[PDB]
Scaffold this active site. Structure first.
Site, PDB file in Angstrom:
ATOM      1  CG  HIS A 123      -1.915  -1.115   1.208  1.00 33.46           C
ATOM      2  ND1 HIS A 123      -2.837  -1.306   0.207  1.00 33.46           N
ATOM      3  CD2 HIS A 123      -2.093  -2.130   2.083  1.00 33.46           C
ATOM      4  CE1 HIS A 123      -3.541  -2.394   0.463  1.00 33.46           C
ATOM      5  NE2 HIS A 123      -3.109  -2.913   1.595  1.00 33.46           N
ATOM      6  N   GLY A 131      -2.018   2.053   4.711  1.00 34.38           N
ATOM      7  CA  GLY A 131      -2.419   0.716   5.107  1.00 34.38           C
ATOM      8  C   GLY A 131      -1.344  -0.160   5.717  1.00 34.38           C
ATOM      9  CG  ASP A 247      -5.036 -10.449   3.848  1.00 37.31           C
ATOM     10  OD1 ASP A 247      -4.589 -11.113   2.883  1.00 37.31           O
ATOM     11  OD2 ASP A 247      -5.019  -9.198   3.883  1.00 37.31           O
TER      12      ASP A 247
HETATM   13  C1  LIG Z   1     -10.328  -4.570  15.295  1.00 43.83           C
HETATM   14  N1  LIG Z   1      -9.434  -3.425  15.050  1.00 43.83           N
HETATM   15  C2  LIG Z   1      -8.822  -2.847  16.235  1.00 43.83           C
HETATM   16  C3  LIG Z   1      -9.201  -2.930  13.716  1.00 43.83           C
HETATM   17  C4  LIG Z   1      -9.870  -3.589  12.603  1.00 43.83           C
HETATM   18  C5  LIG Z   1      -9.672  -3.137  11.268  1.00 43.83           C
HETATM   19  C6  LIG Z   1      -8.792  -1.996  10.977  1.00 43.83           C
HETATM   20  C7  LIG Z   1      -8.633  -1.572   9.530  1.00 43.83           C
HETATM   21  O1  LIG Z   1      -9.063  -2.361   8.626  1.00 43.83           O
HETATM   22  N2  LIG Z   1      -8.035  -0.367   9.246  1.00 43.83           N
HETATM   23  C8  LIG Z   1      -7.801   0.192   7.902  1.00 43.83           C
HETATM   24  C9  LIG Z   1      -6.471  -0.205   7.277  1.00 43.83           C
HETATM   25  C10 LIG Z   1      -6.438  -1.702   6.961  1.00 43.83           C
HETATM   26  C11 LIG Z   1      -5.112  -2.096   6.371  1.00 43.83           C
HETATM   27  C12 LIG Z   1      -4.980  -3.545   6.046  1.00 43.83           C
HETATM   28  C13 LIG Z   1      -3.593  -3.770   5.486  1.00 43.83           C
HETATM   29  C14 LIG Z   1      -3.571  -4.997   4.616  1.00 43.83           C
HETATM   30  O2  LIG Z   1      -3.971  -6.090   5.000  1.00 43.83           O
HETATM   31  N3  LIG Z   1      -3.097  -4.851   3.400  1.00 43.83           N
HETATM   32  O3  LIG Z   1      -3.052  -5.825   2.625  1.00 43.83           O
HETATM   33  C15 LIG Z   1      -8.104  -1.309  12.061  1.00 43.83           C
HETATM   34  C16 LIG Z   1      -8.307  -1.774  13.420  1.00 43.83           C
HETATM   35 CO   LIG Z   2      -4.366  -7.690   3.100  1.00 45.35          CO
END
Ligand SMILES: CN(C)c1ccc(C(=O)NCCCCCCC(=O)NO)cc1
Ligand SMILES: [Co+2]
Ligand SMILES: [K+]
Ligand SMILES: [K+]
Length: 357
Positions: A123, A131, A247
């Site tokens: 990202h 991200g 994931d």
């Molecule tokens: C339960 N908890 C504390 C959370 C749950 C989800 C996020 C989130 O998705 N945030 C937005 C950024 C997500 C980035 C994912 C990175 C990724 O997997 N990239 O491939 C944050 C905190």
């Molecule tokens: Co991901």
């Protein structure tokens, strides 16, 4: 002939320090090792990335802020998404140089496949942390391959759109970025729809396969193979950089797709079977236990072995409860993916995917 394994106790424990995925690197290693898989791989200590090597993709205005913050950052995306926690910089060069290092062992005949599971941060923008990515080890790696290769194919199988890497080359025809990722409104990063194909001399050299919740190893291996089918022709790549975020594996808390390390393994088999240099990166993956299972099993296909179904005892053996087996079983939930809609896409792609040379 022996795949390269980018290890180093320093490195692994350096990654363990990443807030979002605590000790993930370790569980991954220890499991891959407690399977004696490193006994069939050319271990290679990864080097730290130089301020000039990162300067290959990231602006110095940015690289600067990263350094002087790992002791108004809200301008580089250093907020709740990518906290500017002390040392994230020393950490960045670590994973970055770690991918570049594997890039080299690829263009040095040192192997036809280099692996670095701790990388995959896709990202990250030229001058903006995004991200959870503070550096774009994937771009840094593709840029190192651009020294020995004329056409590098990036294949992002992470659950999220590999945007950072996509934009990094949306204006070029020398690097084609393919990305299978859940696409939906409100779901990060939200970009990357089938329509999206890049610009400049690089129009069309950007592929996107927007999928919905539920897709399992079946519909997935078809979509992936067919899409890669067209691409292996229309583009005829020289090198390959494959991002394998876990994931997308039933189990992850992201609770979106519903794959197992097998479906993703088929794709990996299909890609490995082109015999071009292949740089393997990991990335997202929030079921620590499951993530290790998936990559270890993938390390097992890269090595062509057939791993033991029972999980060998190792430091983290405790966390593979309550079954202690290397396989993951699909969640008992639907597949919001329309067979018809998948078609429209597979074609629209096949369509765009032609104006290439
Ligand atoms: C339960 N908890 C504390 C959370 C749950 C989800 C996020 C989130 O998705 N945030 C937005 C950024 C997500 C980035 C994912 C990175 C990724 O997997 N990239 O491939 C944050 C905190
Ligand atoms: Co991901
Ligand atoms: K992806
Ligand atoms: K491109």
């Amino acid at each position: 002939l022996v795949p390269v394994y980018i290890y180093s106790p320093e490195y692994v424990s350096m990654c363990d320090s990443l807030a979002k995925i605590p000790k993930r690197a370790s569980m991954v290693h220890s499991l891959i090792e407690a399977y004696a898989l490193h006994k069939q791989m050319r271990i290679v200590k990864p080097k730290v990335a130089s301020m000039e090597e990162m300067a290959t993709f990231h602006t110095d205005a940015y690289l600067q802020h990263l350094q002087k913050v790992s002791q108004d950052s809200i301008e580089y995306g250093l907020g709740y998404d990518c906290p500017a926690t002390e040392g994230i910089f020393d950490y960045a060069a670590a994973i970055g140089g770690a991918t570049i290092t594997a890039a080299q062992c690829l263009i040095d005949g040192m192997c036809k496949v280099a692996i670095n599971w701790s990388g995959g941060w896709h990202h990250a923008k030229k001058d903006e942390a995004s991200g959870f990515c503070y550096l774009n080890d994937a771009v840094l790696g593709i840029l190192r391959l651009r020294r020995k290769f004329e056409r590098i194919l990036y294949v992002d199988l992470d659950l999220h759109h590999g945007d950072g890497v996509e934009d990094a080359f949306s204006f070029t025809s020398k690097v084609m970025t393919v990305s299978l990722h859940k696409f939906s409104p409100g779901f990060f990063p939200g970009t990357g729809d089938v329509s999206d194909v890049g610009l400049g001399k690089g129009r069309y050299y950007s592929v996107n396969v927007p999928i919905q919740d539920g897709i399992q190893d079946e519909k997935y291996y078809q979509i992936c193979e067919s899409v890669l089918k067209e691409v292996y022709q229309a583009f005829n790549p020289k090198a390959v950089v494959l991002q394998l975020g876990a994931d997308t594996i039933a189990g992850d808390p992201m609770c979106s797709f519903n794959m197992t390390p097998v479906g993703i393994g088929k794709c990996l088999k299909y890609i490995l079977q082109w015999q071009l240099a292949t740089l393997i990166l990991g990335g997202g993956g929030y079921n620590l236990a499951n993530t290790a299972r998936c990559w270890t099993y993938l390390t097992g296909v890269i090595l062509g072995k057939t791993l033991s179904s029972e999980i060998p005892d190792h430091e983290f053996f405790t966390a593979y409860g309550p079954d202690y087996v290397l396989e993951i079983t699909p969640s008992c939930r639907p597949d919001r993916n329309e067979p018809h809609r998948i078609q429209q896409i597979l074609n629209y792609i096949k369509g765009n995917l032609k104006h290439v040379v």
